[PDB]
Ligand binder design. Structure first.
Ligand SMILES: N=C(N)NC(=O)c1nc(-c2ccoc2)c(N2CCCCCC2)nc1N
Length: 245
């Protein structure tokens, strides 16, 4: 997250921290995700496509820090890694960038909700907020494009939804953006998602309900003028989510 503010897991208790085990046994951070039910985390396919083996991954819930344990956290293995069959990557833009992780502890259990662990509601189909609506994004991704390290403490910020028409403009993204993607940015381009925020939540308040509107997917640079963050439009994937869960 470029700009914004540090936070803790109580302010985004559906946030899932996803790591990969290496040959040799070191564990590194991969991507964010969101808990949509006790046994299911939703994320982005591009996070996993290079290493598509479920046994390589570890999922934490209730975690506020990157490389230290948070009190009350839960650790899970990935019992099921489901990537979207129609995923594609061009140079920047990832199509159908959505993935499901079925989680299960070494004791064979799913998430027990707590003060630090809760689910996030999915939107109703094809129902998103209007352009200019302020939404929030959360993650352990880079604080500056030039940074080598990821922040040790969770961050979040606010961005505003951009219309498909505006994001479709050539000075923005041209036809790289489809109707299954959502664009969002700061009016000053001051704050944004970045590398390492992929897979994490874009949350909007719809009709009084906090709703998983987007999944962090891609962008050209981070917090660059005329280059918004691009998000998988969750309300266009409800059948795929339902069928696979
Ligand atoms: N909202 C944005 N403006 N940007 C992002 O959300 C975002 N940005 C980058 C990025 C762009 C230039 O440096 C890093 C990124 N990457 C990691 C993936 C592996 C190839 C490198 C790109 N993933 C992202 N999800």
């Amino acid at each position: 997250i470029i700009g914004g503010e540090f936070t803790t897991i109580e302010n985004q208790p559906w946030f899932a921290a996803i790591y990969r085990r290496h040959r040799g046994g070191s564990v590194t951070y991969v991507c964010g995700g969101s808990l949509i039910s006790p046994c299911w985390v939703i994320s982005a396919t591009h996070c996993f496509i290079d290493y598509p083996k479920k046994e390589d991954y570890i999922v934490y819930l209730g975690r506020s820090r990157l490389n230290s344990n948070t009190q009350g956290e839960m650790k899970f293995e990935v019992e099921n890694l489901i990537l979207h069959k129609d995923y594609s990557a061009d140079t920047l833009a990832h199509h159908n960038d959505i993935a499901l992780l079925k989680i299960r502890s070494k004791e064979g259990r799913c998430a027990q909700p707590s003060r630090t662990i809760q689910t996030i509601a999915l939107p109703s189909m094809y129902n998103d907020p209007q352009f200019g609506t302020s939404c929030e994004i959360t993650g352990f991704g880079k604080e500056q494009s030039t940074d080598y390290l990821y922040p040790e403490q969770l961050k979040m910020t606010v961005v505003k939804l951009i219309s498909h028409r505006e994001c479709q403009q050539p000075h923005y993204y041209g036809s790289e953006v489809t109707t299954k993607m959502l664009c969002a940015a700061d009016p000053q381009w001051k704050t944004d998602s970045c590398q390492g925020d992929s897979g994490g939540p874009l949350v909007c308040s719809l009709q009084g309900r906090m709703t998983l509107t987007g999944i962090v997917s891609w962008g050209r640079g981070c917090a660059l003028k005329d280059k918004p963050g691009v998000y998988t439009r969750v309300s266009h994937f409800l059948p795929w989510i339902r069928s696979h869960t």
